[PDB]
Symmetry: C2
Amino acid sequence: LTKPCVIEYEGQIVGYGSKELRVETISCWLARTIIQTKHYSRRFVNNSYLHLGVFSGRDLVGVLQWGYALNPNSGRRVVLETDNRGYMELNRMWLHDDMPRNSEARAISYALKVIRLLYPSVEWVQSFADERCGRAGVVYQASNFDFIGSHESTFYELDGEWYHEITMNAIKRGGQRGVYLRANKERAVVHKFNQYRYIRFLNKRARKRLNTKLFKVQPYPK
Amino acid sequence: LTKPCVIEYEGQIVGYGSKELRVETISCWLARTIIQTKHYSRRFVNNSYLHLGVFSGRDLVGVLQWGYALNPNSGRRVVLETDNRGYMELNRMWLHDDMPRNSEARAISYALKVIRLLYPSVEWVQSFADERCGRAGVVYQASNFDFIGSHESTFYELDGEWYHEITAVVHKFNQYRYIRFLNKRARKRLNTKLFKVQPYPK
């Protein structure tokens, strides 16, 4: 292990980390391609706007996608007075299986450095863990996220692909995927999962504005 | 200016090109992932064992996959006395739209420099183009390939993935065969009972 730092390319800040592990911005098309092929959902979401590759040496070995929540306006429901660009949600994360089992926590912490530099209006980020990947909760705890509660969510599985109920009923998006989705809605298998919400405050003053009527910092569920 | 040169990482030879356009080795899973998503066949082939990425600046913009022919033994059918590892076929290639219109031929040329360095046993390479894409043929002409004939080939379409006749919607297309001899001595062995260097289809 060596000391991470800011990574630049031709005067532009592009990432943060070490030679054996770092995060750098990648194109949107490339991040979507890897995620929809490798992630357990077999899908990307349109609300991602920060696309990061995980690199080890000269090899691309993972992808992190950050952006809006599935409903972009829901940020002010978690932390009071948060505008749609004042937060981020971890939409997707995948790392190659042959990577060391601490690589995910390092990449997440380095991604927060990128968020501080490239998106300084972001004051807190949130992520979700559920039973489809029990490792994510361990990763978020290792990355020093706080746990602020759980809730049940409805998912639709269609031909190996997984859709949140928000993504399912998002007619307002106008996507060629969503119209086909409600077309084959009767073939889809309905799933209800418990989701465990983690949060990481980048601006310590934003912790005071946590919506205590819905959320509360609690001991880790596992 | 940016002239091409061999690209190294920790002493080891990794690719060839310049900052604005180069090709370097990439992992097999990454090459297969991009190809089966972006290529028109929506599929990779198991015959590929050289996985190259096209880079412009710091960004990956394309993938080239070289390996055995679909029938790995058919290499000696094209060029007599060719071992199964004395040749390569361009199995898959894709490039992003936001690239200069000459980048695909310069990428194929840089891939050949990488083949000379990493696989010196390869004496010649071949590739195929479709009549629905005479543009892919001009690329090989700009890459100094020889055209050595055409043949009608049968394809199959199932679940958006396209399969050759080596194995549903049937198809019958013309396939044009191009060849590039990396060693001059290999040209003497061309199987002129079946293949001859010919003028490009124009």
